[PDB]
Design a protein around this ligand. Structure first.
Ligand code: NI
Ligand code: NI
Ligand code: NI
Ligand code: NI
Ligand code: NI
Ligand code: NI
Lengths: 238, 569, 238, 342, 569
């Protein structure tokens, strides 16, 4: 047979699903493990039969278990069942999203939230800058990127954005479609304001003296919207 | 300055101050007391997120740069329930707080600096507790260790040599040679380990030799003869060597009753196993010692919570382990004096009152090594269902009760066995033995175990899958579990005397070897959230239990939480 | 699924029992392993269904296999099947005692005993002492306990019991219910008669000189039935 | 002589052990799985099921390198670890190499910026180690030509160059024609099948936690998958433009399928385009050599280990795989590791 | 439960929460913010008092038993002004809090356990601060070290080889051999010491060699030529070695003006000496750099506070040190451009605003080594007299201003020179460099110095007297000052590179040798209570100073506190 470790794991999973199906036949309401295993084993068998596509199986995994077939609390615990199955065209990942609908009131890990909003970046004044993507490719910018050093294809008044980042939720992003034009809010970067990396445009302390060096470097490297005055005077370290 | 709705904020970074989360499928509600974060500066890992070179990872890091940081973790500890980032450096907890890059963010201290040497572990929407500590292990089979590991236990303390009949009854590793056997076997495992010696002797030299051979304390078990003479001698030696004593008292009252045992203890520190007495102990009134100042009272999980099936199960279990016969009236009389559904019922309420301070296993010796934490939280849930919310609560939460029950298997056993400077809590300076829980699975099935500052066990899908999530998912050994890495991640606890004599070098042990300390000067008042002393009376006839003159009882449960919803078997 | 090692072991056990049930359906007489597994798997499934108590399952495990369903010799080899199952109220141990009745003649490990009795403690003369438990708690005394140093609540003529133990089978015991009064047989302790421990009443060689010290110590510590004469004369080492 | 053991190979095929150079060290169980498929060397990074490792093949810093190097003593596999290249601090980069790493990984999840690329390449040139890159899909700091300008004509190993696994949308695949680039592909995109696109779409929606009701998430997903580049990737393998096949294990890739999907791609290409014009005779020997090099000798040359492993040559380490021809490319007979059967 | 009047309670144990105490003869009022004590459980030493065997000294101590405990101390630190007990173990601060015996008292943690090995130091009615740190020492005479020690300074950082003319001008220890001379001489003294190398060179190899030879940083001084080239090279080497750079800029504007110097600094971390410029610096506008993020601005004590005698004294002092002549108009022009009573007046207000962050000496090089702390508190008192109470105060006290000025010589210089993990504050884990002050003498004359956890200097009466109090009382060396004990109590700070190369063993040094760290990634925002950045403009003609567009000035004082009331000379 030359079974691999994967084949042994999948055989164990198939028989866990078989046990789940037997218990469902006996009239027992399935718990979390049984529901997960039943969905996974059904998907594997369907993929072995070779008569359905992976997308069909993603849709079919959601009709196996009605809400009355599982215990209270089960539906809210199974966000997604992923299972890798071998189709005639090879191994594909099938994920079923929210296979079971909630019918009871039991929610394990239920979150009870205050209805008050969170104020982020408190004490930081936000300026508004209009930005246009003159390139032919999409550009996405995160919350803590130094906005002065974004893709050179974005065009905006770079001088007003030095030492600033997007005033959005941490870990979120703003997208710029090709040709898209929109305005964004920028707050000052906090901490020691020591900007290293990002395009190597600053790589030092952020201040008015280093803003001139950054503007000159940006203009030399073709960053759009950069207007650094001609007759630039170099310093001893650039 | 922007406004973010609480819903999307919690979905991105987890609950914040004032939010509440249900623990498992129970009724216990945890409220976040405080948050160490600066709103708008949260650490997120991923594509286009903050944890990147020059933004939240420093390009000029401090010299105390972290090896590992856990971002946006909800810490559930006896010290509080709060949100912070946990930084790990060199196997210890280096910092608790904001975490990040001082070049671009305001409130970052040198001990929480993220640099190029830092690994990122996302903890948003997850709970971090300390690793559990099980102090009543019968070392009967090595397979107990992975089972307890997968349930959230990171330290096992006990005794035994294997499936020998002496070990099947007692948590005793007897003598220097057997201690050497078990200490060299311990090099295999992903678990903190310490071993108890035989206290059942009246020879002081024999007692002292076992401590100097590496044991962290004594077990006194009635199967080796729990007599006042042996108790007295063992306590004297333990006071000379600063190690703990655990006792399984005489159920038969052969040499005396419970007060004679207390007289032999003579007001010295003692850790009592299965104090309610179903697991052994002076019939029928061993449970009264749980109110004494010098006693550290522990319970074993088979008796908690009290259910409809508990009494019959314990009766039949007793008839099997002791080879009793139903046609012999003396065996029936022994069995009836032993089980006592009255004391079993009283035990749950005594846990709720803080009279009992430690939960433990009694593994494969009438106890389930993979169920200590689960049965502790089942007991908490049952007590909240029966008696309602505790009066020591501050707010519409169960934070006080959560701390009280969490201490029973994390910090109180660590204090009891003199290891609370290394393990037992999420505190700066302590060993990074941490457990990650998703709140929906809290108390029954953890996400991953961090052992010695490195990931040792986690849920994992099949190795050939394109991502780690797809089925089948079960607990698999991680990299800290293998090679020479396991020697850096694991501790063998020994006595101070053995440590000073170079037990590590004498036996060629490659694990970390640490001494236990501060075992003799602790009392019931040193247990966190479980320090209630009271006068406990037990009726010799009706077996009823009275605490400070009032009868204490609980009613059995026909269904518990965290049981059939989460397990296929 | 987050399966534990216990869940994998129980799944293997369930399918061993399934194989046993299939073979029983085919008409094969089950052997030791098959019978054990069939009983265990039936108990686990019944506990999963949640409609029966553990005691009901202990009684039901004895009706699964008739004697004709197993091979000759199987019934005498299965003394007790224990299995831990998860009920709605948690994990409980279910043990089935002598599930199958013997019908053949084959007994593996059969013991062929001489019909002669064993004479224990030969050459030891036994005295008889009347003992009463004046306490309110049961007291049980083993065969090799120094009977002079038993629970102080037992009342009997302690002087006659010094250096003696119960003349019963090794490892057996005599029980004393609260208020119970009965007579027991005591033989002399053998060997070197060096008594250490038990209440720290002797902790030295047993003889007439040390019996006086033991009696005095027992009287000072309130052991019932101890009559050591007043005006006790201490020795240099007590 | 009398000291020789005999192994019969009549009717069997001997190839060199496979070399997988895109390992996410997420679970130790990957190592036996790759071993049973014919892989004898795994190169990559990670510390375990941490979120940083689930995204990146990075073992960050001296202490984590020590952890993984001491864990490696467990396994039957040749192992080497990549450090974090995503920093602009030269001292931090150099310390990781001196701590035992064989190279750097630059991954966009730690920030693939031109500054970090430039610094990492400078340090790697000073220490003679390889650099692997997972480029910026969002074009945040620049497009593909800006990345090539940061590389500045130095040797670079590109992972999943076709870009379904990440990379400048939509045109990272163009770097596969450059002289200084060593272009690799990951096995989930080869061969291109009817189920490939939908599977990759749903996989992307899961790993990045995207929502179908958000138009920006859809726009990101559409710019990322591109069935056009996936289709082109197979032909580029047939043409010799792509040079290395790899896994991206448990990070959109299957560690036990590198060799199998390589030979599936070869079979599909022969079915579509027929026999190669570089053949000499009624055989496919040239195509067999071309595809076999993709997981044996080319990754070994790329990561500087081709004097030890990568081929059946005298003087090299005896990492050999025995195949019965009926099972060639999917299920081997035995693995010889270090000159002994493992 | 008994009631005690506040008066007798404070007389017995010192001020408690809500009480206020005057600092010296100034107008600054300190309010106790919090108390760690349990009322009725205070630690008192004496006949019939609590600190006795079995009551507050434990008969069963923990294993972390203290060597020394300071009872009922009022801690004045940047972390707060509060009452606690300070426990010292092994030269470090082991605990801050209650302290006592767990057998007889409730709130005692293992790190604050008093046992038989503990020495008692009474602190009731006394103030405990961290030892001062002086970072502008000209090592001109060894006699400076006892003088600074007696004023409350426990760490001296600077350079020099002795009364040589190069040292009389610069804080520079030039080259490997001179570093070896000074490092071996340092073994004599009761002071933490670290030495600055010569930064005035354009040779990178010469710069690197000095750091590897044991220097903790560079001094750039105009007397050796403060040119942009040397500044650039020195900063590059310092960034490679993680050491601090201090600069005395070009007063003559020979190679450029202040903006050229800032361009040479190029946004890297720099510590500027006497930033107001009377001690040297770009005339007349060096003071403008005190608003930059990357600058750590320090002032020297001769210019603070500004008084009626300040200008004439500085003028005549300048005419003497530079050998100027009053009949030469060019020397007068140099002197007038140098002194500038306008900048001197502005400097006091900039200290009050938090623009200046560090106070230092410039010892025997226009500065007084025994007056840094005294002149800092004189400046604080003068500023409170002129501008009133700060608006950042919370209550009828000056706690915020006290913290702001105390940081100028304790924690900010320690952060600036990368030693704030060892010294600088009263925090657990740090070196026990502590100063005891009676509040009546606060800021001018301390009671005793604790160095490395042992008493090194104290007020003391004549040796033949029956008690330690009678006259004459002056500062005398204690036991930590003598024998081989001084090697355990004192630290020589070196660079990480020199430490890794075994500088201690190569030079045969018996003092503790510790590496400096985290010098390059700190900015003005890392200074405690002094992190105010602003745009500072100086008028080229009138020499007026404007901060954020508003003129900043102070008026001179005709009389200061802490001067003639406390000293015979
Ligand atoms: Ni027990
Ligand atoms: Ni036990
Ligand atoms: Ni990638
Ligand atoms: Ni990858
Ligand atoms: Ni100067
Ligand atoms: Ni100076």
């Amino acid at each position: 047979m030359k079974l691999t470790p994967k084949e042994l794991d999948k055989l164990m999973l198939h028989y866990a699903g078989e046990l789940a199906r037997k218990r469902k036949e006996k009239g027992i309401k399935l718990n979390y493990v049984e529901a997960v295993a039943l969905i996974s084993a059904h998907i594997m068998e369907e993929a072995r039969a070779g008569k359905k596509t992976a997308a069909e199986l993603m849709q079919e995994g959601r009709t196996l278990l009605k809400p009355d077939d599982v215990m209270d609390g089960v539906a809210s615990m199974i966000h997604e069942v992923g299972i890798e199955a071998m189709f005639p065209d090879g191994t594909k990942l099938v994920t079923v999203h929210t296979p079971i609908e909630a019918n009871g009131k039991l929610v394990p890990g239920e979150l009870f939230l205050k209805n008050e909003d969170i104020t982020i970046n408190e004490g930081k004044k936000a300026v508004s800058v209009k930005v246009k993507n003159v390139g032919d490719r999409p550009v996405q910018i995160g919350s803590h990127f130094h906005f002065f050093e974004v893709n050179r294809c974005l065009d905006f008044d770079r001088e007003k954005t030095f030492g600033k980042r997007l005033d959005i939720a941490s870990g979120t992003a703003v997208r710029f479609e090709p040709g898209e034009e929109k305005s964004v809010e920028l707050i000052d970067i906090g901490g020691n304001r020591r900007i290293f990396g990002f395009n190597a445009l600053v790589d030092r302390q952020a201040d008015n003296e280093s803003k001139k060096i950054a503007l000159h470097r940006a203009k030399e490297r073709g960053f759009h919207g950069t207007k650094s005055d001609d007759n630039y005077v170099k310093t001893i370290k650039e | 300055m922007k406004k973010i709705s609480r819903k999307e904020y919690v979905s991105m970074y987890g609950p914040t101050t004032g939010d509440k989360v249900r623990l498992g499928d129970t009724d216990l509600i945890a409220e976040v007391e405080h948050d160490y974060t600066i709103y708008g500066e949260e650490l997120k890992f991923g594509g286009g997120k903050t944890l990147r070179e020059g933004m939240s990872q420093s390009n000029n890091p401090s010299k105390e740069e972290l090896d590992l940081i856990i971002t946006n973790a909800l810490i559930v500890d006896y010290t509080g329930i709060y949100k912070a980032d946990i930084g790990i450096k060199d196997g210890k907890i280096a910092g608790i707080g904001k975490g990040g890059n001082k070049d671009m963010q305001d409130g970052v201290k040198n001990n929480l600096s993220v640099g190029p040497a830092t690994e990122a572990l996302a903890g948003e929407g997850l709970i971090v507790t300390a690793g559990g500590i099980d102090t009543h292990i019968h070392f009967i089979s090595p397979q107990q260790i992975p089972t307890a590991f997968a349930s959230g236990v990171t330290t096992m303390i006990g005794g035994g040599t294997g499936p020998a009949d002496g070990t099947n009854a007692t948590t005793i590793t007897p003598g220097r040679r057997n201690l050497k056997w078990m200490l060299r076997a311990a090099e295999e495992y992903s678990m903190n380990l310490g071993f108890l010696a035989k206290g059942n002797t009246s020879n002081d030299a024999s007692l002292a030799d076992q401590i100097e051979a590496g044991a962290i304390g004594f077990k006194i078990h009635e199967d080796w003869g729990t007599t006042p003479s042996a108790i007295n001698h063992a306590l004297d030696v333990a006071d000379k060597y600063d190690v703990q004593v655990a006792i399984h008292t005489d159920t038969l009252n052969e040499a005396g009753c419970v007060e004679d045992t207390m007289a032999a203890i003579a007001g010295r520190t003692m850790h009592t196993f299965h104090t309610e007495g179903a697991g052994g102990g002076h019939a029928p009134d061993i449970i009264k010692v749980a109110g004494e100042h010098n006693i550290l009272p522990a319970s074993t999980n088979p008796t908690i919570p009290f259910t409809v099936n508990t009494e019959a199960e314990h009766m039949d279990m007793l008839m099997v382990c002791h080879h009793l016969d139903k046609s012999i009236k003396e065996d029936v009389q022994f069995a009836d004096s032993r089980i006592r559904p009255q004391t079993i019922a009283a035990e749950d309420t005594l846990h709720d009152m803080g009279i009992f301070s430690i939960t433990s296993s009694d593994s494969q010796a009438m106890g389930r090594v993979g169920e200590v934490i689960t049965r502790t939280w089942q007991t908490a849930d049952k007590n909240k269902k029966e008696f309602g919310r505790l009066k020591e609560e501050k707010g519409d939460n169960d934070n006080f009760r959560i701390k009280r029950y969490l201490s029973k298997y994390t910090i109180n056993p660590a204090i009891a066995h003199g290891i609370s400077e290394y393990v037992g809590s999420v505190e700066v300076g302590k060993v990074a033995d941490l457990v990650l829980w998703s709140p929906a699975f809290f108390g029954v099935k953890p996400n991953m175990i961090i052992k010695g500052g490195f990931i040792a066990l986690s849920q994992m899908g099949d190795a050939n899958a394109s991502i780690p999530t797809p089925q089948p998912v079960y607990y698999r050994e991680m990299f800290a579990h293998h090679g020479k890495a396991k020697y850096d991640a694991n501790i063998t606890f020994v006595s101070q005397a053995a440590y000073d004599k170079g037990i590590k070098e004498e036996l060629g042990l490659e694990r970390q070897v640490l001494p236990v300390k501060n075992c003799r000067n602790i009392t019931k008042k040193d247990m966190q959230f479980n320090d209630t002393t009271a006068h406990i009376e037990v009726n010799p006839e009706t077996y009823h239990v009275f605490v400070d003159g009032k009868e204490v009882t609980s009613k059995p449960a026909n269904k518990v939480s965290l049981a059939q919803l989460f397990s296929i078997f």
